[PDB]
Amino acid sequence: TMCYSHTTTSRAILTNCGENSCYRKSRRHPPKMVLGRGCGCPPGDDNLEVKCCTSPDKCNY
Amino acid sequence: REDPQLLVRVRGGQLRGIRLKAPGGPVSAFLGIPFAEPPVGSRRFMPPEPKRPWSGVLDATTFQNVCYQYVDTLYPGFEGTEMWNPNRELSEDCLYLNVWTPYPRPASPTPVLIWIYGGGFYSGAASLDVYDGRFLAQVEGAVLVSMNYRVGTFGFLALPGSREAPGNVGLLDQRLALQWVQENIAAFGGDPMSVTLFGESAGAASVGMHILSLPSRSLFHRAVLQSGTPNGPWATVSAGEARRRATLLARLVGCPGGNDTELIACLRTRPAQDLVDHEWHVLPQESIFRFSFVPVVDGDFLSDTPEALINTGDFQDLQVLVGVVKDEGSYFLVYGVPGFSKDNESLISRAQFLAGVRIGVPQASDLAAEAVVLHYTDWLHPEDPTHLRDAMSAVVGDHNVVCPVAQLAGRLAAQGARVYAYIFEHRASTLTWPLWMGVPHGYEIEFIFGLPLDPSLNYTTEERIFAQRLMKYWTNFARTGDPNDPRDSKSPQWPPYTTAAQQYVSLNLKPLEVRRGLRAQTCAFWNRFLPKLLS
Ligand SMILES: *[C@@H]1O[C@H](CO)[C@@H](O)[C@H](O)[C@H]1NC(C)=O
């Protein structure tokens, strides 16, 4: 499945994560800035919120 | 070295610009001119230094790197958020400025407009499409300069009182460009005696910091502040809070206790990315419209807090143009307030509205928040989801932009300045933000710059007509100090804002309309009452 990928310093590009989960990492409390997206599902941190999906394309939006 | 029109000798050396195609003709663009030594390594957090001279002919035909910054990726693929992302590579080596002049070069000193970009002092770049001065140059014979200045920690991490991290260096980067424009704008045909600064959001706030800081005050003559001010809840922080944030960020990145010198020394071994990964975690309250590293009241650049400075300075010599858009707070809500998304109508519950007020007015006491709910609730229909949604928007916009501006307008006018005020009420037809957001923060910029003047861009005829008018007011204000007309008695006049009449105008497709009082009762609440309830 295709997903978004980026760091706190790059624009969102779309990449093939194949068959792995995707993730959306953002600041858990306001302001809820998105800190990053990519392949995998890294554990949340209560300070950083991490939501993961498995499909469909662009699901970590 | 063929078109002698694109060849220019500034004090630093020879430059070669590029001819560009506006919609009606050509313009001389001189892009990527280094105005300072790259503030990297040991220069990080330090005040900028003039660019040492160079031999040979430097290529100024392209936009330079963008200052290291956070990229807003809330909505991947959404033009609303992405039109603000940097459009060139990120680097600490980013102190370059751009100059647009008509083609050919002008035969008489033309008035100069220097643009300072916004972006909450944490993001921004003078190379974004919306700041393209090819239009102002080609259509109004404008000579326009725009510079890059450090944002985020690099531009504002401070440890007040230390020599290695004095703070406000991003504002100094701005000033250096101003100094540059002085010593060199002549070679391009710009009148160095008619400089007009103008910016939006944090840019507008910067402009205001220039008016307030004497050293910068002698490098320009007029100023325009769109949707932002130096006074206000977000443009500045106290030295105590700055130090608080700097020393906390330092802790987060492993630097290490710590005395200034060695704390900053450690911070300079840190990878740029690493600082930006922690930038958003030093804010004191859960909130929106709050940025980690902004200008600090150091008693140096800012002799006292903006509030003090605006109630006591002499602005007799000042000519200002200030204004706001219709829905100043629309999109900020979408950054953390429970219930707001660009994807739906964002209707909310009274309960959400209550939770929202704390986030939108983060420094407000339980009592203050309470007073805000009182003021913004329509007690006939206290739960209508729609009204609540709109009220939330209004809370945030009034607290952060509208009232701080009105306060500024008021204080300046009341002290000899000749102020002109406006409200931008036209929602662009191409707007990708949800219709409920109305006319969002920053969406007048395109019209002022003249982008709808580009056939290549989808717009309406009205809009292109509209654009020109704006381009006109600004440039007339730019060269005379008055937005009106050196001849044709324009039947519809824009009167200066005064404490007596408080007139201001509405910029929209319809002809000018004169109104009185900038959200007068509401800004009295914000500017006269709440501050008594928080002391
Ligand atoms: C709008 O969307 C957000 C997230 O997608 C959600 O929290 C909110 O409840 C939605 N509002 C509506 C119209 O249900």
Q: Give the closest of B69, B280, B337 to A27, CB-based.
A: B280
**Cα(B278)–Cα(B485) distance, integer angstroms:** 51
- Structural domains of chain B sorted by starting position, each given as residue range(s) with its CATH number in brackets: 1-535 (3.40.50.1820)
Residue with tokens 């105005």: B35
Distance B345 CA to ligand 1 centre (A): 8
Q: Are B516 and B506 in contact (CB under 8 A)?
A: no
Interface test mutation site (partner B, options A8, A14, A37, max chain B beta carbons within 10 A): A8
To the nearest whole angstrom, how far is the Cα of A2 from the nearest Cα of chain B? 13
Indicate the CATH number for domain A1-61: 2.10.60.10
User: Mind telling me the catalytic residues of B?
Assistant: 201, 328, 441
> Could you tell me how many residues make up chain A?
61
Q: How far apart are the first and last CA of chain A?
A: 13
- Of B302, B168, B322, B295, whose CA–CA distance to B235 is shortest? B295
Count Cβ atoms within 10 A of the Cβ of residue B218 and give its class: 0-12 exposed, 13-18 middle, 19 or more buried.
exposed
Residue with tokens 């602005």: B315
Would the CB atoms of B276 and A8 count as touching at under 8 Å? yes
**Chain A residues within 8 A of B253 when measuring between CB atoms:** none
Query: Would you give the DSSP letter of residue B327?
Result: B
Q: Give the closest of B276, B287, B288 to A9, CB-based.
A: B276
What is the CA angle B483-B485-B488, rounded to 5?
150
Q: Is the CB of B386 under 6 A from ligand 1?
A: no
Query: Would you give the DSSP letter of residue B526?
Result: I
**Domain boundaries of chain A, sorted by first residue:** 1-61
Residue nearest to atom 2 of ligand 1 (CA): B341
Residue partners of A15: CB distance under 8 A and separation at least 6: A2, A3, A4, A5, A38, A39
To the nearest whole angstrom, how far is the Cα of B336 from the nearest Cα of chain A? 5
Q: Are B35 and B95 in contact (CB under 8 A)?
A: yes
| Strand-strand pairing, B26-34 and B18-21 | antiparallel
Residue partners of B291: CB distance under 8 A and separation at least 6: B120, B121, B122, B202, B234
Would the CB atoms of B76 and A58 count as touching at under 8 Å? yes
Residue with tokens 């000899």: B416
**Ramachandran angles phi, psi of B403, nearest 5°:** -70, -35
Q: How many angstroms from the chain centroid is the CA of residue B253? A: 29
**Cα(B75)–Cα(B81) distance, integer angstroms:** 6
Residue partners of B30: CB distance under 8 A and separation at least 6: B6, B8, B15, B17, B18, B60, B98, B99, B100, B101, B188
**Cα(B501)–Cα(B503) distance, integer angstroms:** 5
Q: Tell me, yes or no, if A37 comes closer than 8 A to chain B by beta carbon.
A: yes
Distance B338 CA to ligand 1 centre (A): 9
Calculated CA dihedral for residues B371, B373, B374, B375, nearest 10 degrees: 90
Interface test mutation site (partner B, options A3, A4, A6, A11, max chain B beta carbons within 10 A): A11
Amino acid at B312: T
3 state DSSP class of B440: strand
**Cα(B493)–Cα(B483) distance, integer angstroms:** 9
Q: Give the closest of B71, B82, B290 to A31, CB-based.
A: B290
To the nearest whole angstrom, how far is the Cα of A35 from the nearest Cα of chain B? 8
**Ramachandran angles phi, psi of B59, nearest 5°:** -85, 120
Residue nearest to atom 6 of ligand 1 (CA): B339
Q: Is the CB of B343 under 6 A from ligand 1?
A: yes
Q: Is the CB of B339 under 6 A from ligand 1?
A: yes
What is the CA angle B109-B114-B117, rounded to 5?
165
What are the structure tokens assigned to B35, written together? Answer: 């105005």
Strands, DSSP E only, in B287-427?
A: 296-297, 319-325, 418-424
**Cα(B497)–Cα(B317) distance, integer angstroms:** 16
Technique behind the model: X-ray
Peptide bond into A31 cis (omega under 30): yes
- Of B321, B343, B262, whose CA–CA distance to B77 is shortest? B343
Q: What does the buried/exposed string (b/e) look like for B445-482 if buried means 16 or more CB atoms within 10 Å of the residue's CB?
A: bbbbbbbbbbeeeebeeebbebbbebbebbbbbbbebb
